[PDB]
Prior knowledge:
heterohexamer, A: 172 residues, mainly alpha, Hemagglutinin Ectodomain, Chain B, two-stranded antiparallel ribbon, 4 strands, D: 318 residues, 4-stranded antiparallel sheet, 28 strands, 32% strand, binds a molecule of 5 linked components (NAG-NAG-BMA-MAN-MAN), viral protein, Haemagglutinin
Amino acid sequence: GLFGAIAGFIENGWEGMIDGWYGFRHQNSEGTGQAADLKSTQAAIDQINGKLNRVIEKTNEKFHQIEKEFSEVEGRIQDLEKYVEDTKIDLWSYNAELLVALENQHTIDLTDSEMNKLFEKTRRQLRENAEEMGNGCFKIYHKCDNACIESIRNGTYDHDVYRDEALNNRFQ
Amino acid sequence: GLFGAIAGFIENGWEGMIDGWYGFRHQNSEGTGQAADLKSTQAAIDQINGKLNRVIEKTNEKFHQIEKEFSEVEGRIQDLEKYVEDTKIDLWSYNAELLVALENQHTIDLTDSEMNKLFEKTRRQLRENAEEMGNGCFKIYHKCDNACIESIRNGTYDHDVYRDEALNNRFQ
Amino acid sequence: GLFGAIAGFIENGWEGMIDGWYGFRHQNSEGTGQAADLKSTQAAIDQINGKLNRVIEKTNEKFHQIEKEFSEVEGRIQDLEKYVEDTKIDLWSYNAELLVALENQHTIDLTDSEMNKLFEKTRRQLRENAEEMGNGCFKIYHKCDNACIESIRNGTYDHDVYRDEALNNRFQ
Amino acid sequence: NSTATLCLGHHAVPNGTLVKTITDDQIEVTNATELVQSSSTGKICNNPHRILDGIDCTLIDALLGDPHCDVFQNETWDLFVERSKAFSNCYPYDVPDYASLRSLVASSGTLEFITEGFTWTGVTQNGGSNACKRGPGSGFFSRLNWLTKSGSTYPVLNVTMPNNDNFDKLYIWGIHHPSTNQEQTSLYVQASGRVTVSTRRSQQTIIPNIGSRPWVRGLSSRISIYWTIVKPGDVLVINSNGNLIAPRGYFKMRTGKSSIMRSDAPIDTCISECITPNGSIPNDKPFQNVNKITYGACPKYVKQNTLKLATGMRNVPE
Amino acid sequence: NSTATLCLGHHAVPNGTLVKTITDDQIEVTNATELVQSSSTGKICNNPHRILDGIDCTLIDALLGDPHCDVFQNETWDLFVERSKAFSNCYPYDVPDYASLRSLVASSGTLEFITEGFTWTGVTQNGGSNACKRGPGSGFFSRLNWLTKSGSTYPVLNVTMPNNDNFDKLYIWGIHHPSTNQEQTSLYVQASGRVTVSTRRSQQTIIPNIGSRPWVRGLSSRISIYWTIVKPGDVLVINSNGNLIAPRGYFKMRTGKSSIMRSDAPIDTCISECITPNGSIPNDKPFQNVNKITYGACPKYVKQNTLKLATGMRNVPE
Amino acid sequence: NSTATLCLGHHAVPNGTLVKTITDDQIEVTNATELVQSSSTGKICNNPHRILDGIDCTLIDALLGDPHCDVFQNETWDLFVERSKAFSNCYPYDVPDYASLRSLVASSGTLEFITEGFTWTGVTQNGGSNACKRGPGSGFFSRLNWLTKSGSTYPVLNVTMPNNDNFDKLYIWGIHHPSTNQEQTSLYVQASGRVTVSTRRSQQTIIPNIGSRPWVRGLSSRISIYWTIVKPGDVLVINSNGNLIAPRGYFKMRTGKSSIMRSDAPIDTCISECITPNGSIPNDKPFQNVNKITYGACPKYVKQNTLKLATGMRNVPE
Ligand SMILES: *[C@@H]1O[C@H](CO)[C@@H](O[C@@H]2O[C@H](CO)[C@@H](O[C@@H]3O[C@H](CO[C@H]4O[C@H](CO)[C@@H](O)[C@H](O)[C@@H]4O)[C@@H](O)[C@H](O[C@H]4O[C@H](CO)[C@@H](O)[C@H](O)[C@@H]4O)[C@@H]3O)[C@H](O)[C@H]2NC(C)=O)[C@H](O)[C@H]1NC(C)=O
Ligand SMILES: *[C@@H]1O[C@H](CO)[C@@H](O[C@@H]2O[C@H](CO)[C@@H](O[C@@H]3O[C@H](CO[C@H]4O[C@H](CO)[C@@H](O)[C@H](O)[C@@H]4O)[C@@H](O)[C@H](O[C@H]4O[C@H](CO)[C@@H](O)[C@H](O)[C@@H]4O)[C@@H]3O)[C@H](O)[C@H]2NC(C)=O)[C@H](O)[C@H]1NC(C)=O
Ligand SMILES: *[C@@H]1O[C@H](CO)[C@@H](O[C@@H]2O[C@H](CO)[C@@H](O[C@@H]3O[C@H](CO[C@H]4O[C@H](CO)[C@@H](O)[C@H](O)[C@@H]4O)[C@@H](O)[C@H](O[C@H]4O[C@H](CO)[C@@H](O)[C@H](O)[C@@H]4O)[C@@H]3O)[C@H](O)[C@H]2NC(C)=O)[C@H](O)[C@H]1NC(C)=O
Ligand SMILES: *[C@@H]1O[C@H](CO)[C@@H](O[C@@H]2O[C@H](CO)[C@@H](O)[C@H](O)[C@H]2NC(C)=O)[C@H](O)[C@H]1NC(C)=O
Ligand SMILES: *[C@@H]1O[C@H](CO)[C@@H](O[C@@H]2O[C@H](CO)[C@@H](O)[C@H](O)[C@H]2NC(C)=O)[C@H](O)[C@H]1NC(C)=O
Ligand SMILES: *[C@@H]1O[C@H](CO)[C@@H](O[C@@H]2O[C@H](CO)[C@@H](O)[C@H](O)[C@H]2NC(C)=O)[C@H](O)[C@H]1NC(C)=O
Ligand SMILES: *[C@@H]1O[C@H](CO)[C@@H](O[C@@H]2O[C@H](CO)[C@@H](O)[C@H](O)[C@H]2NC(C)=O)[C@H](O)[C@H]1NC(C)=O
Ligand SMILES: *[C@@H]1O[C@H](CO)[C@@H](O[C@@H]2O[C@H](CO)[C@@H](O)[C@H](O)[C@H]2NC(C)=O)[C@H](O)[C@H]1NC(C)=O
Ligand SMILES: *[C@@H]1O[C@H](CO)[C@@H](O[C@@H]2O[C@H](CO)[C@@H](O)[C@H](O)[C@H]2NC(C)=O)[C@H](O)[C@H]1NC(C)=O
Ligand SMILES: *[C@@H]1O[C@H](CO)[C@@H](O)[C@H](O)[C@H]1NC(C)=O
Ligand SMILES: *[C@@H]1O[C@H](CO)[C@@H](O)[C@H](O)[C@H]1NC(C)=O
Ligand SMILES: *[C@@H]1O[C@H](CO)[C@@H](O)[C@H](O)[C@H]1NC(C)=O
Ligand SMILES: *[C@@H]1O[C@H](CO)[C@@H](O)[C@H](O)[C@H]1NC(C)=O
Ligand SMILES: *[C@@H]1O[C@H](CO)[C@@H](O)[C@H](O)[C@H]1NC(C)=O
Ligand SMILES: *[C@@H]1O[C@H](CO)[C@@H](O)[C@H](O)[C@H]1NC(C)=O
């Protein structure tokens, strides 16, 4: 939520998206369509999996310890044992809480950053043939086919072929 | 300080601002003015209050404990008690320090991010009738009234009505 | 890696850069060149040094403690001492790990943010006389000398002198 | 003019506050709040906890029945406050494992004493001393019974007491260490004493140590204090042939929230949930730097004297 | 139309999951995973650990050789499980520092007993009791030797035992506390007993305490149990003149991974690496909220009952 | 050409360094620094701390006055170093609660001994032994006094000592356990001994245990060592009728920074503020993985063997 992409200038999500996490949706002169982008989804999935499998691997193995349940009242030694146990439990619960609280924030912020990165890349591709409409979509001022949007999707859009037509369409 | 909005491309603050945390200040053809924006201020205040009231709620309640001040020198038990107390104090002071150190950084970064979000929204509203002057202000290339700036402030600016005039003013 | 500047839209690094961390490299009508920018490098160095010298200052000074190595088997007191020591070691190793894991991420993200800040400042300077080519370079549509690039480097570029020539060059 | 301008910005204050960050150590923000409570009021509020003021008596003397602590019979406390001006004015005594008994009785929270009918046949009961005057005449502890020889003999005492209730019973007894070898045989005809107290799972046997001690209030003899705990379904047996300070009953043992604290602060009628030896401290902040001894819902003791948390943006004045 | 459009967006799910963050306390994401294991299966798997089920016997009774624990001779355990239905059916005894011996033998992991040839001349061996019937006749513990007078005298026993091996030896002995002063002189002609057990660096001397105790299984006498550890190169000397429960050999002392646990859960043939007094729990999660007593590679005990970690983006539905 | 170009970028290095992050486990940066100190020099520097090398003596033998530790009289230490080649060459002795006395004297930091004039009338002073030769003749500890019968009798010793100074006094005394019942009555005419040492608030009574022990340096008798602490305004009384190892004075008790450490590392003339049983280690890093026993301003012991902190940006080479 630091970049303002998810829950920011993109109003809602797409519940019909089942291929990946991030994707496109175009409205053309031949109809409508929809697709996904594998790279951003893969980056997010790899980062989240790395984090998850980072935290959950084990570190402790204890065999013999002290007594923690007593049937009598004795004195100093029992008091010290109970104090030690209470201190250990209270000091580990705080770590358990803080780790989750920090990692959830970092996960949310990185999954928000990936969307902004994809948006900025798509903006940088359409050099001066498109205008940002403010709600997550680009208005492309020249006429594409279903093969023009796919060149924008797999990163080989050639902007200089449609430059003169777009400039005469948008500025006059 | 990660986005470069506060203490970045905005030189100083406005000490005459007493309504909210973020606001506007326009220079028109009929005079000058000033106002505030409630939404960004409200988001920042809600986040900071949530964080604050998150950390300060209580968790401990202790009634009987061990002895921590002695009048004699005895031996092993007293040494172990003093060691336990020293370890507990040293382990809690580190947490006290680290929590504050992390949360202050996060607060500063989020209060910096809100300004950048407001700026980017205002830039996205003025589609091609404005130019960014580099110091936090927009130069609007058509002529507004005191009712044109207020349409930009409450999020209902219609860019296509002044498009032809602005394009002829800025590009020729 | 949250802003997508380093290892993002900038393909690789410059191993011939030995003056600073961030710098420029221009291709002109009189030849090529290279230089550095002191301010971004200084900001990054100051932040990283502050962090480093923040963590490494000392806090502990212990003179008398408990016994931690025994030659016999005794019973309850020895068990409690070994438990205390094991708990202390296990609780300090986790902090040692988490501090480094958090600070490395923050260092990487801030050193990535400085590059994006420099790029955005350079973009804001060249108001409408330049176009972003998508790989980290700007195409400047008027003709500069070795003294025009240096005005862009020390922050005194005057965009309005070359505006008409650039607008006639890029749009027609 | 045929143009306009629209500038954006944030607020600033003339004096801001310096806070610490991950990068910087002193950065100026518009506002900050304090997180470490470092002051105390100086008094101990008596609400909503039940505080008992041990003016001139300790816990053990109020347990045994010192004649100047007879106002502390069946005192029920939630926190016992022990003053430093306390002293003893009865028979000089001694407790092996004093801290254990003090912490056992402090955390129980009651001095409720049920008297029981023991049958000691062949001895003289209600022994007295001139170092423990209760009124104008000689006296002794009010919870103990000093038995001596009856005429010319001291038989082997052997008594029993079963526990048919559903709670634990605490018995307090003792042994008398004389000063010379002449006063031993003039109080207990046997030249050596021995006290055995046994349950179905434990046993304690003590033997008196004749010798001289420093004079304390006019005496060079001593008393050693021991205790026994009888659980429901158990039984207690006492065997002896001299040097026995018999009990008169049992204390009821409870479990709950109770403790003890050494402090010389007065007591007022305010309301607070945390109590330190310096007085009551508020608990609105998570940390505190007053005392590491605390009772109630108290903040944690840290070593830092100030920690400020930022609740505003950065301060960049004109 | 001579234009086009290209919109970007992300996915959402109808029901998401609420998680906690640094700022918010309840924020809805598309997916989350649980981090705290809070349930148990109810049984204790016997793989890959070696579990020993102490059905009706404790560890100390299986050490001494109770007649109803004779199936536990040379038991080798990796984790001893103690039930609450355990009881004793032999001579009533007592152990000073019981927890120390219990933890010393629990962490050793063996009950291997090597018998040694002691020479007791002048006394009668293999004493018996009618409270410890082993079969149809009287009996005693199987690892101890009750010596009494031989005809009309009881000489001063003085025996030695060297340690020439390369491991430590654990000797278990005891002392007999009689009931009256008549049965003392009818078993040991001396009117007072004493037992000294000494190595080159330590010594223990115990003296019997004559007295009456509560009746337990028909007896009012007692036995106190002590132990000695002989290191390689040392020597053991036993001196006595009455009231000696001699040993018959030594236990071998080892060091490794072994412990003891009180639990009333049955044992099955599954596979698990963690064991709690509630049964075996899986260890796929880093934290657990079942029991703070654990054996093996177990997660840590926390006080929270649920902690969810987000593994997806934020959920913004239509 | 009528245009220009201006590219921006950052630096890279050919070999960078792998560090761990919140997301990745191995990410390559341009530079990193080490945070865990994991090596030692091997020697113990004697600056600015005051190190005392206990070559062939322990602390207790240097306290009592062993004849081969007479160079350690009034040694003032800041850290006592105990070697493993240490041994005893005097009368065989024994200390109940050895660790308590060792830690009490180790943390005091002085062996300063003030001799006092006790008056023992009716006994013979300066007893000797052939197991503790100081020179060519028999000897004993230099801080203790072995009293035996004077001609044909051994009266009841009863002595007093007041404390009028403003510091605490430490008295070390002992009791003699003989070997047979014939050597008891040939040194102390009474058939049973007893030693009582009392202050105004405590008392200790010990009785000798006659018996045989393993032969150590030619003797089967023993000595048990006890200690007493007298606070300002108190008084000490010693009562006895046999088996007393009297004191000759008191040690001065201080409070400060002092300790003890077992190590077999040599001592050099370098400068270091931290000392581990492996030698001195620098303290420029916050963490260390050498030893968990440390003296001075030492880094904390962690279980990880390496932890690298990034001090540069990410490394993206050509
Ligand atoms: C073994 O050794 C110990 C120690 O040496 C002996 O104990 C001392 O015993 C005598 C008894 O004769 C004690 O004496 C008395 O002290 C009382 C308290 O006084 C002290 O404080 C006041 C000021 O408050 C001083 O003025 C005074 O000098 C003392 O220092 C006095 O009040 C006593 O006077 C009373 O009683 C006796 C007898 O009842 C009368 O004759 C006197 O006239 C007077 O009325 C008395 O002086 C002394 O305090 C003990 N010392 C300690 C350190 O305890 C043992 O007696 C000895 N045992 C044997 C068997 O020999
Ligand atoms: C010092 O004081 C103690 C305590 O008062 C005395 O100890 C008691 O000693 C008597 C022995 O005479 C014990 O009596 C016996 O109890 C056995 C167990 O029974 C209990 O439980 C059953 C139910 O299970 C009840 O019905 C019964 O009443 C008891 O409460 C009985 O089985 C015994 O009967 C057997 O033995 C005696 C003698 O062998 C026979 O005469 C009887 O007919 C019967 O066969 C007997 O009743 C009593 O339990 C002890 N009490 C405690 C608390 O331990 C000491 O004796 C005393 N010492 C001296 C020297 O006086
Ligand atoms: C109760 O039981 C104990 C244990 O059985 C008896 O103690 C033993 O007592 C004898 C005394 O007679 C001790 O014997 C002596 O050992 C000395 C040390 O030697 C050991 O080590 C050397 C090698 O260094 C070996 O060669 C040697 O065999 C020993 O194993 C010897 O130096 C002694 O020789 C000297 O003294 C005696 C008497 O002074 C002379 O007659 C000899 O000629 C020689 O000069 C002697 O052999 C034995 O060590 C003790 N054992 C233990 C384990 O302590 C008690 O005596 C017994 N008590 C009663 C009352 O019976
Ligand atoms: C990227 O997408 C474009 C979509 O346009 C692919 O290109 C077309 O490729 C087919 C196959 O030969 C041709 O018939 C079309 O004429 C192409 N159209 C255009 C506009 O180029 C292209 O192959 C894709 N490249 C990769 C690497 O996936
Ligand atoms: C948002 O601000 C605009 C400011 O222009 C408000 O609009 C004007 O509304 C008044 C009231 O009827 C009219 O007389 C003006 O002609 C309007 N001017 C323009 C330029 O539209 C508008 O009402 C505000 N809307 C909200 C929801 O606050
Ligand atoms: C910033 O860089 C510019 C580079 O152009 C410097 O300017 C030139 O200054 C020299 C010195 O007098 C003149 O001869 C040139 O004509 C200038 N050229 C232009 C295009 O202005 C300028 O001095 C630098 N300023 C600072 C503060 O470093
Ligand atoms: C609360 O009371 C404690 C104990 O009386 C105070 O601690 C002492 O403070 C003085 C002055 O700094 C030191 O000389 C003592 O050594 C301290 N005693 C200790 C630490 O046991 C403490 O300062 C009081 N706090 C407040 C806020 O009044
Ligand atoms: C595991 O077993 C322990 C002990 O039997 C259970 O703890 C007890 O829970 C009950 C019911 O909540 C309480 O009344 C007791 O006071 C608890 N005893 C303690 C805490 O010592 C525990 O609930 C069991 N856990 C599971 C998951 O079955
Ligand atoms: C410092 O000294 C300690 C103790 O001598 C060393 O610890 C031992 O290391 C060996 C070899 O790894 C192990 O076999 C022992 O079990 C260790 N003893 C322990 C842990 O008590 C330690 O390795 C030394 N460190 C350095 C850096 O020299
Ligand atoms: C600073 O914050 C506190 C509460 O956190 C508030 O009471 C105070 O008014 C704030 N300061 C200003 C100047 O608003
Ligand atoms: C204390 O309480 C018990 C039980 O209620 C009662 O028998 C006893 O008399 C009370 N004590 C006093 C001082 O009356
Ligand atoms: C949520 O994540 C878990 C693993 O973390 C996965 O098994 C599950 O399929 C995910 N949920 C959805 C709806 O994909
Ligand atoms: C236990 O092991 C020892 C040594 O192997 C052996 O001597 C002894 O006989 C074994 N016990 C039984 C019950 O046979
Ligand atoms: C890496 O950092 C260290 C100090 O942190 C410095 O001494 C070293 O020169 C740096 N490496 C390079 C290549 O500059
Ligand atoms: C030790 O110091 C004390 C007090 O200064 C002194 O009386 C004594 O003689 C010193 N010891 C030696 C060995 O002289």
